Amino acid sequence: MKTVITEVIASADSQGRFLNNTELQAANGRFQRATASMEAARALTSNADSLVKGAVQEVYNKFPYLTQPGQMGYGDTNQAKCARDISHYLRFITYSLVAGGTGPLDDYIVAGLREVNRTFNLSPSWYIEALKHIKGKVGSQLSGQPLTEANAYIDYCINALS
Amino acid sequence: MKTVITEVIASADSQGRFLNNTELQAANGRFQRATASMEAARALTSNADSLVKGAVQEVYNKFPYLTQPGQMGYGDTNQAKCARDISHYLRFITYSLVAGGTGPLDDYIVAGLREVNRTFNLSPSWYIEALKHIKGKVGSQLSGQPLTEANAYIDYCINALS
Amino acid sequence: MKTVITEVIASADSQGRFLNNTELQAANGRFQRATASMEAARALTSNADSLVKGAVQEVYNKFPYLTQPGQMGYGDTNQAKCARDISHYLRFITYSLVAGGTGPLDDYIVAGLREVNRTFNLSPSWYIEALKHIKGKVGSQLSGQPLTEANAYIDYCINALS
Amino acid sequence: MKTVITEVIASADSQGRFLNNTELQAANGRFQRATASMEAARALTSNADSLVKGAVQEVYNKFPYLTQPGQMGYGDTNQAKCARDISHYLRFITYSLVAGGTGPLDDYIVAGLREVNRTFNLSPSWYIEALKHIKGKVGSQLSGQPLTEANAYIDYCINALS
Amino acid sequence: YSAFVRPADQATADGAAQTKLGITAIAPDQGVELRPNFTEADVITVIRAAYKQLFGNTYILESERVIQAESLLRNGSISVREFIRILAKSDLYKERFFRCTSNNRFIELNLKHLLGRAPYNQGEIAEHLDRYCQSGYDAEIDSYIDSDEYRRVFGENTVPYFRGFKYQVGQSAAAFERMRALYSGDAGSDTDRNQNGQRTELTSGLADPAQPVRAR
Amino acid sequence: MQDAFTKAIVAADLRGSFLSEQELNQLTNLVKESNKRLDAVNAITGNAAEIISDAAHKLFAEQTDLIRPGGNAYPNRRMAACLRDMEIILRYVSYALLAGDASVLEDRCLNGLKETYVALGTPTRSVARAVQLMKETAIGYVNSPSGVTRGDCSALVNEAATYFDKAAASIA
Amino acid sequence: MQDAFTKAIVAADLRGSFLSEQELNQLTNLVKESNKRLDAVNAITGNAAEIISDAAHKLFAEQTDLIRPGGNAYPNRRMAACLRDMEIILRYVSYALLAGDASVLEDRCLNGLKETYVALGTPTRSVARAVQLMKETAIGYVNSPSGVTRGDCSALVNEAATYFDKAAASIA
Amino acid sequence: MQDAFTKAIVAADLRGSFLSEQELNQLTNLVKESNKRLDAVNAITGNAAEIISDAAHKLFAEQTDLIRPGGNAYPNRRMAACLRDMEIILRYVSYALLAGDASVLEDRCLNGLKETYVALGTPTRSVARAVQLMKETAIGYVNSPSGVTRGDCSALVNEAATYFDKAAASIA
Amino acid sequence: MQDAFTKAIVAADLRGSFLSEQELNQLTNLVKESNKRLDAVNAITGNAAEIISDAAHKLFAEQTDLIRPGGNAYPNRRMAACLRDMEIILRYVSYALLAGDASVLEDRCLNGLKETYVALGTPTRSVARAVQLMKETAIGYVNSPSGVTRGDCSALVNEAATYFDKAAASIA
Numbered sequence A, B, C, D: 001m002k003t004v005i006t007e008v009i010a011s012a013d014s015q016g017r018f019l020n021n022t023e024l025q026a027a028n029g030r031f032q033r034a035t036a037s038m039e040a041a042r043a044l045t046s047n048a049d050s051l052v053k054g055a056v057q058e059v060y061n062k063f064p065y066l067t068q069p070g071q072m073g074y075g076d077t078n079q080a081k082c083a084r085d086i087s088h089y090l091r092f093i094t095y096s097l098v099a100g101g102t103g104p105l106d107d108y109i110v111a112g113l114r115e116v117n118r119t120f121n122l123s124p125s126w127y128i129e130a131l132k133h134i135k136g137k138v139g140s141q142l143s144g145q146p147l148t149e150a151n152a153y154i155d156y157c158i159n160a161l162s
Numbered sequence E: 001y002s003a004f005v006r007p008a009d010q011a012t013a014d015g016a017a018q019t020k021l022g023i024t025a026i027a028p029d030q031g032v033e034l035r036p037n038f039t040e041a042d043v044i045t046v047i048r049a050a051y052k053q054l055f056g057n058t059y060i061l062e063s064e065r066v067i068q069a070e071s072l073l074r075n076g077s078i079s080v081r082e083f084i085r086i087l088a089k090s091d092l093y094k095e096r097f098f099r100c101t102s103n104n105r106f107i108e109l110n111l112k113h114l115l116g117r118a119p120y121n122q123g124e125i126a127e128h129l130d131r132y133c134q135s136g137y138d139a140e141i142d143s144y145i146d147s148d149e150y151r152r153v154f155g156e157n158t159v160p161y162f163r164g165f166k167y168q169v170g171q172s173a174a175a176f177e178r179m180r181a182l183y184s185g186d187a188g189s190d191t192d193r194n195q196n197g198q199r200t201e202l203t204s205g206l207a208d209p210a211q212p213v214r215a216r
Numbered sequence F, G, H, I: 001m002q003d004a005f006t007k008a009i010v011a012a013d014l015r016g017s018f019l020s021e022q023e024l025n026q027l028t029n030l031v032k033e034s035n036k037r038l039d040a041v042n043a044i045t046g047n048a049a050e051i052i053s054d055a056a057h058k059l060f061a062e063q064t065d066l067i068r069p070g071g072n073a074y075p076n077r078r079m080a081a082c083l084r085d086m087e088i089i090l091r092y093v094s095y096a097l098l099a100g101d102a103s104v105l106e107d108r109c110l111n112g113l114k115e116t117y118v119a120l121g122t123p124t125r126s127v128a129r130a131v132q133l134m135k136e137t138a139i140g141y142v143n144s145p146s147g148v149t150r151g152d153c154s155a156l157v158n159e160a161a162t163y164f165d166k167a168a169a170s171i172a
């Protein structure tokens, strides 16, 4: 899993050299930032649910036809899934903030994203909206660096999805 | 040349991916620290000379026989060289503080250290003393993080020499 | 282990061919020489001790300060070691004469020489003197080809040490 | 080309080390032997022709049918070739004696022997006889080491042919 | 000045440790490098070596040997790493040393034939397994010689070697143990043709929890 | 590799001297801007996918032929490459931007690029065009972000431009 | 790989839940100690060469045989290896110390180390001994540095120990 | 690798002593025999092809089944192997003979051989047989050469035998 | 590779003839000198380290700039290379000396060397200088040994020179 700390170790390890000043400097960076990161996570964790509802919802407004019978958005099972899924995305995001690296995201969400989505005919687009809507809400509860961090990660997914 | 900034780029580059949050965190670390680093460099740069004199000198006290005729420490040429050399070490150290990485040290000083020393029969020990004596002096002009940084680098050489 | 005989086998083996005339010629060389080699070994083996004493001693004359307290040459343990070590060098040399190859030397003495010496702060220089002094003594007890052989091997180490 | 001298250089070269005593011993062997080798060559060179005639001839006695019309041994062109060829074998052998290695043989005669012979339907057997008959004659003009050398090389071909 | 030396107890010596493992000089390796000016013999020795290292040490018939790849070495215009690419892209290796064994098997055996190391971790074995369907086989083998460490050591103009069975950098555990499994005796060689077919020396079971144990 | 700091060092080395106090003050101030610098980079990386997507659309609206049979962007296979390429260039540019130095970009990326394009028969002109298209979009984001402390980024903006342009030029 | 943070995540994942507030407070405090953590590491790395050098001397004074003809540290070549080994182990330990987790150490360094040693005929016991010798020296530095703000490092010191010990145990 | 000389050295090393004068006299004498030793080797190498050819013929006359469908020497492919193998073994034996030591043979040639043979399904017994067949023929030449100075080679002859036999045994 | 013997062969081959009696007498004589030849080589190899060490000292006393910042021998890394290079050249020279032929030296070592040096910005002049410095020192040993039977080595001495010089020339 890719976090700041793991990477420097990795790089140090590959070369076969002790952790010198260079790397520690880097680590320090991660730790200083954490305070902001951590704050953001506490904020998302708390409002989770509400964000999720809002997102799921949004998607349907954006793509009305989904709710019609014979479609994917139709019938509760699917709605449940849709909810679940977004929860996940969120969950991971929090994780990543705390871990101080994309790692968590990469391994759970991103890797194999495409094929999953292809085989089940999930349109990336949808997820994206979810995220965007979220981003917009988050853009109220947070501010300054905490916010900035939140964004970075949220986006990172947008980019991976698209 | 190995600095924080170069490495993250390298790692990013290898994987073939954009610089994401992970790396930036690291970079930030380097920059925050710099203020202390920079200070240290200004201090060494100023007292350079005096440190050099003191060191060279020390070495001779430590190893009297060097100054005897037929030895290495004997005859001005050699003394001049001895001075020059230590200057170098110092010079680089400053560099490294500023660059925020061991890089400068590695490429100039460390790489090929052994063989140089072997072929000219320079005993690592000597240099070391120089450094140690230095370290001791530096341990007055500086304080707190600035100091800590100075040490790290000075040492790094001790370890490379030995 | 590298001796004449082993090598030709090796080379033959690599190509996947029988030992043909080419190699035998080489082997023959080794055997013809042996008579001289063997003689040399008998001479060193006999005077071993005396050579050792003389060498150890020499080193101290060459580097008086070693015998001062707080140095390496000081206190019996160290002296014992110093003796032991040189004995070894000698021992191996004899071996190599008999084996008709550097092999014995390479594998015991040479391989890893540097790092050992570095980590324990043994100055190659010392050993060298030992050898030189030896060489000088040997240059009396022996003569002609026997001598020549003795030298070759002794030197081979000088070069490896330096 | 494979001779004693070339090989040791090669081996030395590969390892990236100077020619030490080991190799020189080998070389020495080659040189001592040469005196015998050289003698042998002078003997073959002189009687060349006569050896060739005798051989060619032999082959026909051994394999009468070859001289019948519609066969390979039949018609002068073929006989001429047959002569030429054996000359070659001889020529090379001399070379190899002088070079002090199989080298010359390997590169001219041996490498690709099979396929040549296959595509032109030359039966190894024939050549062999030629050689054997030769060997027998050589076993008169020469004696002691000179002889021994001659054999070695002659054989080496027998083995390569078969 | 006692110069007590003494035979000591264990009396293992230099040689005994390796004879115990049975390496018999497989762990020590002398690299072979091609030169722009080279004797044909020197090319031959390279071919000889190349064959062994990438092949099981299995017998190679003259018919088996691919002459077109051998041609071109004398000429130039083929990097030796590229020469080694031609081999394995060869039908010879795919039909035999690839078909019989399981996907995992050839990955380990490639990772052995092309590089001394046995596989440090389950995940990296898995990385090549992702490739099997992800892309064509040729790519995956190409990926090995294109991998960095293949390049880093014996990168160009050098026959690969079983640098395994010595200390290599970043060996995640059981380097020796796995390698001990993967190398039989020097005379002994992986066989395209074998009873019980061909199975992975290394337990699929492990590659994470425990060191492998294999007949030697 | 190289970057702003390392660079200054190297220069100083050849003179054989400690860093001049004046020169330190270049670096000292450079540090101060870091935060700005960083956000700039962050903005690019954050929008990456889009930047490209966008630029492409416009590229192909302009030079219709590229996507027509016989053009260079046809068929799929080729198209893919062309997209990939754009991205790469971008990636590098970013790198540079962080480093505070062209080098990385020149050395890893731009070197030999032109020649490649030539050998393939790819029309260098069009490539260059794309680079610019990208440039403008990118700046767009760098310069108009959300949640960032309001201030002047011009200095950085221009340096960004330059990088894009070195790219455009050496390709073209 | 793994480390303190990642680990806690993973646990949380399997439960399928957002992180407990309690759990955050583990990490929150862990952060606070960082500075201490770092210096600890720095101290080891700074003294590395020495730590080893020292440990060795003591190792060989104790087990004379290792250095005697026929022993395991004899001749030079072997000696070298033995030194190298010690170093490595150390290197790893350090790594762990930074991560705040044994894992890295266990996986790359320890797992199957024993078996190796066995196969070679190297006496596992002696290796273990060396590890400890190292431990003590190392702690020595961690705990007695110069120019550092004075406070309590015990917490870290002990964790360091543990790492050394896992090593000692699994080798032994 | 190893050979007579090297070997004696190694032994001496573990005792921790210079070479015994007695021990030198083993090697001194060994040297004297060289010339004989060499010729022995030369004889084998000179006749190589034939030795094998011969042995094979006899092997197959005896154990008809090997060449019958279902046997181990059938079809061609296999046959070839079997020939190659014999050769190899021989090659090694020769090597040993020169070295004045079994080792080389044991390590490169015999080590693992049995197990291989097992895995293949090759009947070890027959292999062994072949080895002997070879042995006898080989000795034949070693012992009856032409143009060599007449003397006693028995000593060497027997040592040769032993090598063949170690082969036979470890295969079997 | 090539050497004196092989060479003469090759020539003879193209004529299609047995070796000229005249030509044999070149080789016959060459043999006679062997012993001398050998000792020469031995002397170089024996003193190797020194030869270099020496030459270097003198090289750097002369061309002070090489060791100054901005020069080619600075910093350490480069220095090392420069030493290594000298050695290599020497190594080859030796080889040649034994072979009795320039080839090996020319082909493996000298070929392309100039151009390399040029591309790097290494001053070819200085390299050449070093080669000579070496030459003189080397001859020094070849020509003044101890415990060797006294006689005339000139013939060999000059050939040695030539090798050095081919080196000097092709580099320069």
Ligand SMILES: *[C@H](C)[C@H]1/C(=C/c2[nH]c(/C=C3N=C(/C=C4\NC(=O)C(CC)=C4C)C(C)=C\3CCC(=O)O)c(CCC(=O)O)c2C)NC(=O)[C@@H]1C
Pocket: A059, A066, A072, A073, A074, A078, A079, A081, A082, A083, A085, A088, A108, A109, A116, A120, A122, A126, A127
């Ligand atoms: C919400 C925007 C839309 C929606 C989604 C939906 N998803 C599936 C099926 C799957 N979706 C995922 C996603 C995840 N599962 C995971 O474990 C992870 C990583 C932690 C993710 C992001 C997966 C893997 C599946 C496939 C297997 C499964 O059953 O979950 C469906 C069902 C489609 C089907 O044919 O099974 C749906 C409908 N639901 C909506 O209404 C939106 C359009």
Ligand SMILES: *[C@H](C)[C@H]1/C(=C/c2[nH]c(/C=C3N=C(/C=C4\NC(=O)C(CC)=C4C)C(C)=C\3CCC(=O)O)c(CCC(=O)O)c2C)NC(=O)[C@@H]1C
Pocket: B059, B066, B072, B073, B074, B078, B079, B081, B082, B083, B085, B088, B089, B108, B109, B116, B120, B122, B126, B127, I057, I060, I067, I074, I075, I076, I079
């Ligand atoms: C000081 C403790 C002793 C001393 C020094 C001394 N040095 C040399 C020779 C060299 N010194 C160096 C070292 C460096 N050169 C570099 O470029 C750098 C890195 C930036 C270093 C550290 C080098 C390369 C040499 C080799 C040749 C040269 O410098 O020209 C000597 C001369 C030794 C000789 O035999 O030439 C000396 C004496 N002087 C003293 O009195 C102390 C013993």
Ligand SMILES: *[C@H](C)[C@H]1/C(=C/c2[nH]c(/C=C3N=C(/C=C4\NC(=O)C(CC)=C4C)C(C)=C\3CCC(=O)O)c(CCC(=O)O)c2C)NC(=O)[C@@H]1C
Pocket: C059, C066, C072, C073, C074, C077, C078, C079, C081, C082, C083, C085, C088, C089, C108, C109, C116, C120, C122, C126, C127, G057, G060, G067, G074, G075, G076, G079
């Ligand atoms: C003699 C000029 C100096 C001296 C010697 C001395 N040696 C050591 C320690 C070691 N010596 C060696 C050397 C060898 N050991 C071998 O196995 C071989 C090859 C056969 C050699 C040449 C080794 C291995 C060591 C290091 C390990 C050890 O404990 O022996 C010391 C002690 C160093 C220490 O820190 O313990 C000494 C003093 N004594 C003198 O007075 C001279 C400086």
Ligand SMILES: *[C@H](C)[C@H]1/C(=C/c2[nH]c(/C=C3N=C(/C=C4\NC(=O)C(CC)=C4C)C(C)=C\3CCC(=O)O)c(CCC(=O)O)c2C)NC(=O)[C@@H]1C
Pocket: D059, D066, D072, D073, D074, D077, D078, D079, D081, D082, D083, D085, D088, D089, D108, D109, D116, D120, D122, D126, D127, D130
């Ligand atoms: C003599 C024993 C029999 C014989 C000879 C014969 N040879 C050929 C053809 C070739 N023989 C060789 C031999 C060599 N050519 C070389 O260059 C070398 C190495 C330097 C050797 C040893 C080769 C290469 C050929 C093929 C090329 C050629 O034929 O010119 C023939 C011709 C057969 C044909 O044309 O089909 C013959 C007849 N003939 C006899 O009388 C003996 C049975």
Ligand SMILES: *[C@H](C)[C@H]1/C(=C/c2[nH]c(/C=C3N=C(/C=C4\NC(=O)C(CC)=C4C)C(C)=C\3CCC(=O)O)c(CCC(=O)O)c2C)NC(=O)[C@@H]1C
Pocket: E057, E058, E059, E186, E187, E188, E189, E190, E191, E192, E193, E194, H066, H072, H073, H078, H079, H081, H082, H083, H085, H086, H088, H089, H108, H109, H116, H120, H122, H123, H126, H127, H130
């Ligand atoms: C001949 C007297 C008998 C015989 C031979 C035979 N061998 C094989 C197969 C193999 N032989 C080896 C052995 C070696 N590996 C080495 O490197 C060396 C020299 C150091 C030897 C001698 C190996 C490894 C194989 C496997 C080859 C492969 O997998 O392709 C066979 C064929 C069996 C098979 O299925 O491969 C045979 C026939 N066996 C007999 O029947 C004779 C009595």
Ligand SMILES: *[C@H](C)[C@H]1/C(=C/c2[nH]c(/C=C3N=C(/C=C4\NC(=O)C(CC)=C4C)C(C)=C\3CCC(=O)O)c(CCC(=O)O)c2C)NC(=O)[C@@H]1C
Pocket: F066, F071, F072, F073, F074, F078, F079, F081, F082, F083, F085, F086, F088, F089, F108, F109, F110, F112, F113, F116, F117, F120, F122, F123, F126, F127, F130
């Ligand atoms: C897209 C804007 C335009 C375009 C590009 C294009 N490129 C290729 C092929 C290659 N382009 C490169 C790219 C790079 N090589 C490098 O070294 C770097 C930096 C690391 C880059 C940017 C290379 C090497 C190739 C050849 C191999 C490959 O797979 O890319 C093509 C395809 C060439 C072909 O003949 O199929 C294309 C089309 N061409 C356009 O149409 C656009 C205007």
Ligand SMILES: *[C@H](C)[C@H]1/C(=C/c2[nH]c(/C=C3N=C(/C=C4\NC(=O)C(CC)=C4C)C(C)=C\3CCC(=O)O)c(CCC(=O)O)c2C)NC(=O)[C@@H]1C
Pocket: A033, A144, A145, A148, B024, B025, B028, F032, F033, F035, F036, F038, F039, F040, F042, F142, F143, F144, F145, F148, F149, F150, F151, F152, F153, F156
């Ligand atoms: C410039 C293109 C636009 C802009 C930027 C701007 N940023 C700041 C201040 C900060 N920006 C950051 C961001 C980072 N620092 C990091 O370490 C990382 C990686 C994790 C990032 C992404 C930080 C920490 C600061 C300091 C605190 C803060 O955010 O305010 C400013 C303020 C001035 C300054 O130099 O600090 C500005 C102006 N604002 C614009 O108007 C441009 C569009």
Ligand SMILES: *[C@H](C)[C@H]1/C(=C/c2[nH]c(/C=C3N=C(/C=C4\NC(=O)C(CC)=C4C)C(C)=C\3CCC(=O)O)c(CCC(=O)O)c2C)NC(=O)[C@@H]1C
Pocket: E014, E017, E018, E165, E166, E167, E171, E173, E174, E175, E176, G066, G072, G073, G074, G078, G079, G081, G082, G083, G085, G086, G088, G089, G108, G109, G110, G113, G116, G120, G122, G123, G126, G127, G130
């Ligand atoms: C030193 C404290 C004791 C000792 C050790 C020793 N080890 C070897 C040889 C090897 N050791 C290893 C071990 C490692 N493999 C790994 O993966 C790691 C890190 C996870 C290690 C540390 C290996 C691979 C070797 C074998 C190859 C090599 O020698 O480089 C030796 C040498 C013995 C030999 O013949 O191999 C020794 C001496 N023995 C002592 O003397 C100490 C008590």
Ligand SMILES: *[C@H](C)[C@H]1/C(=C/c2[nH]c(/C=C3N=C(/C=C4\NC(=O)C(CC)=C4C)C(C)=C\3CCC(=O)O)c(CCC(=O)O)c2C)NC(=O)[C@@H]1C
Pocket: A024, A025, A028, B033, B144, B145, B148, G032, G033, G035, G036, G038, G039, G040, G042, G142, G143, G144, G145, G146, G148, G149, G150, G151, G152, G153, G156
């Ligand atoms: C523990 C074994 C020892 C110790 C450590 C200690 N350190 C601090 C505080 C700091 N130490 C550092 C060091 C770093 N921070 C970084 O970012 C880096 C990487 C470049 C390093 C090396 C810093 C910056 C601080 C803050 C300022 C300061 O030096 O005090 C403390 C204070 C308490 C705390 O940090 O929570 C302590 C206790 N003190 C001991 O008792 C041992 C000597």
Ligand SMILES: *[C@H](C)[C@H]1/C(=C/c2[nH]c(/C=C3N=C(/C=C4\NC(=O)C(CC)=C4C)C(C)=C\3CCC(=O)O)c(CCC(=O)O)c2C)NC(=O)[C@@H]1C
Pocket: C024, C025, C028, D033, D144, D145, D148, H032, H033, H035, H036, H038, H039, H040, H042, H142, H143, H144, H145, H148, H149, H150, H151, H152, H153, H156
């Ligand atoms: C032994 C199986 C049979 C035998 C051998 C025998 N050889 C010699 C003497 C010599 N043999 C050689 C041969 C070589 N020496 C070399 O350097 C090489 C490689 C180039 C070879 C092949 C030499 C030079 C001698 C000396 C002169 C000579 O030929 O006599 C003897 C004589 C006794 C001795 O100790 O040398 C013997 C007996 N003779 C037989 O009849 C055995 C069946």
Ligand SMILES: *[C@H](C)[C@H]1/C(=C/c2[nH]c(/C=C3N=C(/C=C4\NC(=O)C(CC)=C4C)C(C)=C\3CCC(=O)O)c(CCC(=O)O)c2C)NC(=O)[C@@H]1C
Pocket: C033, C144, C145, C148, D024, D025, D028, I032, I033, I034, I035, I036, I038, I039, I040, I042, I142, I143, I144, I145, I148, I149, I150, I151, I152, I153, I156
């Ligand atoms: C020439 C530069 C100087 C010189 C050389 C010289 N050497 C000899 C004679 C011999 N030299 C050797 C040496 C070797 N032969 C070998 O096989 C080996 C490698 C193992 C060596 C090192 C030998 C054996 C001889 C013959 C016996 C002897 O030297 O007593 C001579 C004498 C003439 C001759 O060619 O035999 C000479 C002149 N002597 C000088 O003073 C030159 C400066």
